[PDB]
PDB file of C-alpha atoms and ligand atoms in Angstrom:
ATOM      1  CA  UNK A   1      59.319  92.412  32.688  1.00 49.16           C
ATOM      2  CA  UNK A   2      59.726  93.896  29.241  1.00 54.92           C
ATOM      3  CA  UNK A   3      58.586  91.922  26.261  1.00 55.03           C
ATOM      4  CA  UNK A   4      58.986  94.116  23.161  1.00 55.36           C
ATOM      5  CA  UNK A   5      61.840  94.604  20.749  1.00 55.31           C
ATOM      6  CA  UNK A   6      60.723  98.000  19.495  1.00 54.56           C
ATOM      7  CA  UNK A   7      61.701  98.802  15.930  1.00 56.16           C
ATOM      8  CA  UNK A   8      63.402 102.132  15.352  1.00 58.70           C
ATOM      9  CA  UNK A   9      62.062 104.540  12.745  1.00 58.59           C
ATOM     10  CA  UNK A  10      63.305 103.884   9.185  1.00 58.74           C
ATOM     11  CA  UNK A  11      65.381 106.832   8.274  1.00 59.62           C
ATOM     12  CA  UNK A  12      65.610 108.154  11.863  1.00 60.34           C
ATOM     13  CA  UNK A  13      67.281 111.588  11.907  1.00 57.81           C
ATOM     14  CA  UNK A  14      69.496 111.512  15.010  1.00 59.61           C
ATOM     15  CA  UNK A  15      70.774 115.070  14.769  1.00 60.46           C
ATOM     16  CA  UNK A  16      67.245 116.481  14.628  1.00 60.24           C
ATOM     17  CA  UNK A  17      66.028 114.432  17.591  1.00 62.40           C
ATOM     18  CA  UNK A  18      69.194 115.012  19.663  1.00 59.64           C
ATOM     19  CA  UNK A  19      69.258 118.767  18.942  1.00 57.77           C
ATOM     20  CA  UNK A  20      69.470 119.922  22.567  1.00 58.62           C
ATOM     21  CA  UNK A  21      65.795 120.827  22.863  1.00 60.39           C
ATOM     22  CA  UNK A  22      63.044 119.548  25.172  1.00 60.61           C
ATOM     23  CA  UNK A  23      60.408 116.873  24.506  1.00 56.88           C
ATOM     24  CA  UNK A  24      57.307 116.582  26.667  1.00 58.23           C
ATOM     25  CA  UNK A  25      55.419 113.356  27.262  1.00 58.14           C
ATOM     26  CA  UNK A  26      51.806 113.987  26.312  1.00 59.75           C
ATOM     27  CA  UNK A  27      50.489 110.405  26.446  1.00 59.24           C
ATOM     28  CA  UNK A  28      51.842 107.062  27.624  1.00 58.02           C
ATOM     29  CA  UNK A  29      51.059 103.358  27.594  1.00 60.48           C
ATOM     30  CA  UNK A  30      52.608 100.894  30.035  1.00 62.60           C
ATOM     31  CA  UNK A  31      52.050  97.265  29.045  1.00 63.40           C
ATOM     32  CA  UNK A  32      52.108  96.481  32.780  1.00 63.90           C
ATOM     33  CA  UNK A  33      49.746  99.410  33.586  1.00 60.36           C
ATOM     34  CA  UNK A  34      49.902  98.798  37.338  1.00 62.19           C
ATOM     35  CA  UNK A  35      53.585  99.728  37.181  1.00 63.65           C
ATOM     36  CA  UNK A  36      53.180 103.492  37.005  1.00 66.16           C
ATOM     37  CA  UNK A  37      50.618 105.952  38.432  1.00 67.45           C
ATOM     38  CA  UNK A  38      47.561 106.859  36.344  1.00 67.55           C
ATOM     39  CA  UNK A  39      48.375 110.590  36.752  1.00 68.97           C
ATOM     40  CA  UNK A  40      51.950 111.510  35.883  1.00 66.39           C
ATOM     41  CA  UNK A  41      54.213 113.882  34.073  1.00 65.30           C
ATOM     42  CA  UNK A  42      57.499 113.557  32.404  1.00 64.35           C
ATOM     43  CA  UNK A  43      59.789 115.386  29.994  1.00 63.28           C
ATOM     44  CA  UNK A  44      63.307 115.122  28.649  1.00 60.70           C
ATOM     45  CA  UNK A  45      66.001 116.984  26.852  1.00 60.79           C
ATOM     46  CA  UNK A  46      68.099 115.122  24.253  1.00 61.73           C
ATOM     47  CA  UNK A  47      71.301 116.391  22.673  1.00 64.04           C
ATOM     48  CA  UNK A  48      75.039 115.969  22.122  1.00 62.70           C
ATOM     49  CA  UNK A  49      77.182 117.696  24.756  1.00 62.73           C
ATOM     50  CA  UNK A  50      80.939 117.867  24.102  1.00 62.74           C
ATOM     51  CA  UNK A  51      80.686 114.950  21.713  1.00 65.05           C
ATOM     52  CA  UNK A  52      78.679 112.729  24.067  1.00 69.06           C
ATOM     53  CA  UNK A  53      75.087 111.641  23.342  1.00 66.61           C
ATOM     54  CA  UNK A  54      72.969 112.688  26.335  1.00 68.02           C
ATOM     55  CA  UNK A  55      69.504 112.730  27.769  1.00 67.73           C
ATOM     56  CA  UNK A  56      68.214 114.605  30.780  1.00 66.56           C
ATOM     57  CA  UNK A  57      64.941 113.350  32.308  1.00 66.74           C
ATOM     58  CA  UNK A  58      62.333 114.892  34.581  1.00 68.20           C
ATOM     59  CA  UNK A  59      59.580 112.994  36.406  1.00 69.68           C
ATOM     60  CA  UNK A  60      56.870 114.531  38.570  1.00 68.93           C
ATOM     61  CA  UNK A  61      53.887 112.844  40.219  1.00 68.40           C
ATOM     62  CA  UNK A  62      51.322 115.585  40.318  1.00 68.75           C
ATOM     63  CA  UNK A  63      49.465 114.135  43.322  1.00 67.69           C
ATOM     64  CA  UNK A  64      52.306 113.045  45.589  1.00 69.27           C
ATOM     65  CA  UNK A  65      54.746 115.743  44.370  1.00 71.71           C
ATOM     66  CA  UNK A  66      57.495 113.104  44.064  1.00 73.36           C
ATOM     67  CA  UNK A  67      60.099 114.744  41.754  1.00 71.10           C
ATOM     68  CA  UNK A  68      63.392 113.580  40.276  1.00 70.50           C
ATOM     69  CA  UNK A  69      65.847 114.385  37.537  1.00 69.21           C
ATOM     70  CA  UNK A  70      68.260 112.060  35.756  1.00 72.30           C
ATOM     71  CA  UNK A  71      71.142 112.417  33.354  1.00 68.29           C
ATOM     72  CA  UNK A  72      72.596 109.660  31.105  1.00 69.67           C
ATOM     73  CA  UNK A  73      75.127 109.208  28.307  1.00 71.18           C
ATOM     74  CA  UNK A  74      73.417 107.006  25.716  1.00 70.19           C
ATOM     75  CA  UNK A  75      75.290 104.152  24.113  1.00 73.22           C
ATOM     76  CA  UNK A  76      74.360 103.170  20.594  1.00 71.23           C
ATOM     77  CA  UNK A  77      72.980  99.734  19.780  1.00 71.07           C
ATOM     78  CA  UNK A  78      71.768 100.688  16.303  1.00 69.78           C
ATOM     79  CA  UNK A  79      70.311 103.810  14.724  1.00 69.61           C
ATOM     80  CA  UNK A  80      67.485 104.965  16.966  1.00 72.05           C
ATOM     81  CA  UNK A  81      68.126 102.332  19.651  1.00 71.24           C
ATOM     82  CA  UNK A  82      70.123 103.156  22.758  1.00 72.38           C
ATOM     83  CA  UNK A  83      71.096 101.880  26.198  1.00 71.38           C
ATOM     84  CA  UNK A  84      71.324 104.574  28.897  1.00 70.56           C
ATOM     85  CA  UNK A  85      72.985 104.051  32.390  1.00 72.03           C
ATOM     86  CA  UNK A  86      71.336 106.874  34.426  1.00 70.02           C
ATOM     87  CA  UNK A  87      72.378 108.940  37.421  1.00 68.98           C
ATOM     88  CA  UNK A  88      69.829 110.679  39.623  1.00 67.17           C
ATOM     89  CA  UNK A  89      70.741 114.373  40.035  1.00 66.46           C
ATOM     90  CA  UNK A  90      69.236 117.520  41.429  1.00 69.31           C
ATOM     91  CA  UNK A  91      68.147 120.187  38.925  1.00 70.93           C
ATOM     92  CA  UNK A  92      71.688 121.619  38.909  1.00 70.51           C
ATOM     93  CA  UNK A  93      73.301 118.281  38.037  1.00 73.00           C
ATOM     94  CA  UNK A  94      74.687 117.403  41.452  1.00 77.32           C
ATOM     95  CA  UNK A  95      74.738 113.643  41.845  1.00 77.81           C
ATOM     96  CA  UNK A  96      72.249 112.072  44.246  1.00 81.11           C
ATOM     97  CA  UNK A  97      72.567 108.455  43.097  1.00 84.98           C
ATOM     98  CA  UNK A  98      75.640 107.540  40.996  1.00 86.22           C
ATOM     99  CA  UNK A  99      75.683 105.459  37.843  1.00 82.75           C
ATOM    100  CA  UNK A 100      75.690 101.742  38.605  1.00 85.07           C
ATOM    101  CA  UNK A 101      75.402  98.589  36.634  1.00 87.76           C
ATOM    102  CA  UNK A 102      71.873  97.417  36.595  1.00 87.28           C
ATOM    103  CA  UNK A 103      70.484 100.919  36.572  1.00 90.23           C
ATOM    104  CA  UNK A 104      69.808 101.521  32.891  1.00 87.08           C
ATOM    105  CA  UNK A 105      67.016 102.050  30.418  1.00 87.70           C
ATOM    106  CA  UNK A 106      66.742 101.158  26.783  1.00 87.17           C
ATOM    107  CA  UNK A 107      65.349 103.833  24.500  1.00 85.90           C
ATOM    108  CA  UNK A 108      64.009 103.307  20.978  1.00 85.32           C
ATOM    109  CA  UNK A 109      62.716 106.097  18.737  1.00 89.70           C
ATOM    110  CA  UNK A 110      59.935 104.402  16.791  1.00 85.58           C
ATOM    111  CA  UNK A 111      58.794 107.572  14.968  1.00 83.02           C
ATOM    112  CA  UNK A 112      59.941 111.211  14.999  1.00 83.12           C
ATOM    113  CA  UNK A 113      59.477 114.412  13.101  1.00 84.38           C
ATOM    114  CA  UNK A 114      60.359 117.949  14.048  1.00 82.80           C
ATOM    115  CA  UNK A 115      57.463 118.307  16.479  1.00 86.52           C
ATOM    116  CA  UNK A 116      56.360 114.848  17.625  1.00 88.29           C
ATOM    117  CA  UNK A 117      57.728 111.407  18.415  1.00 89.51           C
ATOM    118  CA  UNK A 118      56.823 107.914  19.609  1.00 90.06           C
ATOM    119  CA  UNK A 119      59.341 106.132  21.835  1.00 89.62           C
ATOM    120  CA  UNK A 120      59.623 102.848  23.697  1.00 90.58           C
ATOM    121  CA  UNK A 121      61.601 102.446  26.900  1.00 93.78           C
ATOM    122  CA  UNK A 122      62.367  99.508  29.175  1.00 96.01           C
ATOM    123  CA  UNK A 123      63.618 100.547  32.618  1.00 98.12           C
ATOM    124  CA  UNK A 124      65.924  98.348  34.687  1.00 99.08           C
ATOM    125  CA  UNK A 125      66.497  99.586  38.211  1.00 99.66           C
ATOM    126  CA  UNK A 126      68.104  97.056  40.514  1.00 98.35           C
ATOM    127  CA  UNK A 127      65.582  94.339  41.350  1.00 96.28           C
ATOM    128  CA  UNK A 128      62.232  96.091  40.478  1.00 97.46           C
ATOM    129  CA  UNK A 129      60.009  94.246  37.905  1.00 98.76           C
ATOM    130  CA  UNK A 130      59.142  96.820  35.174  1.00 99.65           C
ATOM    131  CA  UNK A 131      57.350  96.413  31.751  1.00 98.52           C
ATOM    132  CA  UNK A 132      57.365  98.156  28.367  1.00 98.72           C
ATOM    133  CA  UNK A 133      56.524 101.875  28.341  1.00 96.21           C
ATOM    134  CA  UNK A 134      55.536 103.737  25.191  1.00 96.65           C
ATOM    135  CA  UNK A 135      55.351 107.502  25.158  1.00 95.60           C
ATOM    136  CA  UNK A 136      54.024 110.055  22.696  1.00 91.50           C
ATOM    137  CA  UNK A 137      56.212 113.177  22.792  1.00 87.87           C
ATOM    138  CA  UNK A 138      55.697 116.690  21.495  1.00 86.84           C
ATOM    139  CA  UNK A 139      57.792 119.862  21.422  1.00 87.79           C
ATOM    140  CA  UNK A 140      54.675 121.649  22.759  1.00 85.30           C
ATOM    141  CA  UNK A 141      53.578 120.411  26.151  1.00 86.32           C
ATOM    142  CA  UNK A 142      49.895 121.100  25.330  1.00 86.67           C
ATOM    143  CA  UNK A 143      49.733 119.535  21.866  1.00 88.98           C
ATOM    144  CA  UNK A 144      47.054 117.025  21.055  1.00 94.03           C
ATOM    145  CA  UNK A 145      48.524 114.036  19.175  1.00 93.62           C
ATOM    146  CA  UNK A 146      48.298 114.587  15.435  1.00 95.33           C
ATOM    147  CA  UNK A 147      47.818 112.130  12.638  1.00 97.03           C
ATOM    148  CA  UNK A 148      51.544 111.434  11.974  1.00 98.52           C
ATOM    149  CA  UNK A 149      52.204 110.192  15.497  1.00 98.26           C
ATOM    150  CA  UNK A 150      48.809 108.480  15.915  1.00 96.06           C
ATOM    151  CA  UNK A 151      49.416 106.617  12.642  1.00100.83           C
ATOM    152  CA  UNK A 152      52.803 105.547  14.028  1.00104.74           C
ATOM    153  CA  UNK A 153      51.034 104.229  17.131  1.00106.43           C
ATOM    154  CA  UNK A 154      48.791 102.170  14.838  1.00105.25           C
ATOM    155  CA  UNK A 155      51.741 100.990  12.791  1.00103.04           C
ATOM    156  CA  UNK A 156      53.304  99.647  16.024  1.00101.39           C
ATOM    157  CA  UNK A 157      50.102  97.578  16.441  1.00101.05           C
ATOM    158  CA  UNK A 158      49.029  99.699  19.406  1.00101.42           C
ATOM    159  CA  UNK A 159      45.755 101.520  20.037  1.00102.39           C
ATOM    160  CA  UNK A 160      46.129 105.199  20.815  1.00103.98           C
ATOM    161  CA  UNK A 161      42.792 105.126  22.652  1.00100.95           C
ATOM    162  CA  UNK A 162      44.465 103.110  25.380  1.00100.72           C
ATOM    163  CA  UNK A 163      47.196 105.703  26.037  1.00102.08           C
ATOM    164  CA  UNK A 164      46.847 107.817  29.141  1.00103.80           C
ATOM    165  CA  UNK A 165      47.121 111.586  28.708  1.00104.01           C
ATOM    166  CA  UNK A 166      49.327 113.718  30.948  1.00 99.70           C
ATOM    167  CA  UNK A 167      47.593 116.969  29.955  1.00 97.52           C
ATOM    168  CA  UNK A 168      45.062 117.312  32.746  1.00 96.87           C
ATOM    169  CA  UNK A 169      47.623 117.327  35.579  1.00 95.26           C
ATOM    170  CA  UNK A 170      48.615 121.070  35.761  1.00 98.67           C
ATOM    171  CA  UNK A 171      52.242 120.067  35.185  1.00102.13           C
ATOM    172  CA  UNK A 172      54.782 122.820  34.821  1.00 99.80           C
ATOM    173  CA  UNK A 173      58.322 122.148  33.622  1.00102.14           C
ATOM    174  CA  UNK A 174      61.721 123.711  34.210  1.00105.44           C
ATOM    175  CA  UNK A 175      62.998 123.724  30.643  1.00103.59           C
ATOM    176  CA  UNK A 176      66.094 125.594  31.635  1.00103.96           C
ATOM    177  CA  UNK A 177      67.159 122.831  33.995  1.00105.05           C
ATOM    178  CA  UNK A 178      66.534 120.133  31.408  1.00102.23           C
ATOM    179  CA  UNK A 179      68.681 121.892  28.819  1.00103.03           C
ATOM    180  CA  UNK A 180      71.498 122.626  31.244  1.00103.66           C
ATOM    181  CA  UNK A 181      71.486 119.051  32.597  1.00108.48           C
ATOM    182  CA  UNK A 182      72.600 117.791  29.173  1.00105.43           C
ATOM    183  CA  UNK A 183      76.082 118.997  30.019  1.00104.73           C
ATOM    184  CA  UNK A 184      76.224 117.290  33.450  1.00106.28           C
TER     185      UNK A 184
HETATM  186  C1  LIG B 201      60.892 109.297  27.917  1.00107.94           C
HETATM  187  C2  LIG B 201      60.340 108.552  28.770  1.00107.94           C
HETATM  188  C3  LIG B 201      60.783 108.024  30.074  1.00107.94           C
HETATM  189  C4  LIG B 201      62.048 107.536  30.392  1.00107.94           C
HETATM  190  C5  LIG B 201      63.273 107.392  29.521  1.00107.94           C
HETATM  191  C6  LIG B 201      61.998 107.164  31.750  1.00107.94           C
HETATM  192  C7  LIG B 201      63.083 106.737  32.541  1.00107.94           C
HETATM  193  C8  LIG B 201      63.049 106.477  33.882  1.00107.94           C
HETATM  194  C9  LIG B 201      64.251 106.281  34.706  1.00107.94           C
HETATM  195  C10 LIG B 201      65.718 106.284  34.178  1.00107.94           C
HETATM  196  C11 LIG B 201      63.862 106.107  35.981  1.00107.94           C
HETATM  197  C12 LIG B 201      64.677 105.901  37.176  1.00107.94           C
HETATM  198  C13 LIG B 201      65.183 107.139  37.782  1.00107.94           C
HETATM  199  C14 LIG B 201      66.140 106.975  38.934  1.00107.94           C
HETATM  200  O1  LIG B 201      65.852 106.125  39.833  1.00107.94           O
HETATM  201  O2  LIG B 201      67.147 107.687  38.980  1.00107.94           O
HETATM  202  C15 LIG B 201      62.390 106.218  35.934  1.00107.94           C
HETATM  203  C16 LIG B 201      61.594 106.016  37.030  1.00107.94           C
HETATM  204  C17 LIG B 201      60.232 106.073  37.020  1.00107.94           C
HETATM  205  N1  LIG B 201      59.443 106.367  35.890  1.00107.94           N
HETATM  206 FE1  LIG B 201      60.076 106.853  34.076  1.00107.94          FE
HETATM  207  N2  LIG B 201      60.727 107.306  32.288  1.00107.94           N
HETATM  208  C18 LIG B 201      60.019 107.897  31.224  1.00107.94           C
HETATM  209  C19 LIG B 201      58.647 108.161  31.335  1.00107.94           C
HETATM  210  C20 LIG B 201      57.830 107.904  32.364  1.00107.94           C
HETATM  211  C21 LIG B 201      56.410 108.109  32.366  1.00107.94           C
HETATM  212  C22 LIG B 201      55.592 108.727  31.279  1.00107.94           C
HETATM  213  C23 LIG B 201      55.932 107.557  33.563  1.00107.94           C
HETATM  214  C24 LIG B 201      54.610 107.430  33.949  1.00107.94           C
HETATM  215  C25 LIG B 201      53.817 107.242  34.578  1.00107.94           C
HETATM  216  C26 LIG B 201      57.083 107.103  34.332  1.00107.94           C
HETATM  217  C27 LIG B 201      57.020 106.623  35.556  1.00107.94           C
HETATM  218  C28 LIG B 201      58.134 106.308  36.347  1.00107.94           C
HETATM  219  C29 LIG B 201      58.125 105.939  37.722  1.00107.94           C
HETATM  220  C30 LIG B 201      56.813 105.864  38.584  1.00107.94           C
HETATM  221  C31 LIG B 201      59.393 105.798  38.162  1.00107.94           C
HETATM  222  C32 LIG B 201      59.866 105.439  39.527  1.00107.94           C
HETATM  223  C33 LIG B 201      60.252 103.901  39.560  1.00107.94           C
HETATM  224  C34 LIG B 201      60.591 103.599  40.965  1.00107.94           C
HETATM  225  O3  LIG B 201      61.693 103.692  41.370  1.00107.94           O
HETATM  226  O4  LIG B 201      59.860 103.074  41.792  1.00107.94           O
HETATM  227  N3  LIG B 201      58.211 107.318  33.576  1.00107.94           N
HETATM  228  N4  LIG B 201      61.933 106.452  34.639  1.00107.94           N
END
């Protein structure tokens, strides 16, 4: 179960964040740690497509090779805080699992600049019991977290030392698919 009402960044710049480009997860913290594998990789694209606010997600377990993409149109709750009903798709946007009520995530941008971000998400997927997930993002998949984003982690009353890095997993991303999926 999720327990946090994450606070969005003061002054969040939506057009910069949702610019159509890719964000890579470099580090994550699940407050129910035993909810997600210790070795993982994930990335997303975020942008407006034909007037609609969109995200495209990619998940890859580097040990099991379990792979999936998602696309969602984000609904606005407040600036920097969204609710996203997702559909599982292949890399070309063909639907594998349609949108349905009860399959959604919340998404809060706690901090962002041009290169880095800190987000919170709470996933709801049917009857699974999932907890709060924080992720440090960067535009560069290999970037070490800098002081702006690590300070933001502190300001959220979190300890960056507890985050798990995704960097040592050889993950390789299909950026082209993530960008194109924004339209799907
Ligand atoms: C930007 C950040 C992330 C968002 C918005 C996000 C969103 C989601 C969504 C929507 C699903 C369900 C997909 C579907 O069934 O179609 C999912 C599943 C999953 N995510 Fe994430 N995720 C993110 C980061 C991560 C990270 C960093 C991990 C780390 C370990 C992770 C682990 C998982 C796992 C293991 C599942 C499969 C749940 C299951 O069905 O059993 N996610 N995520």
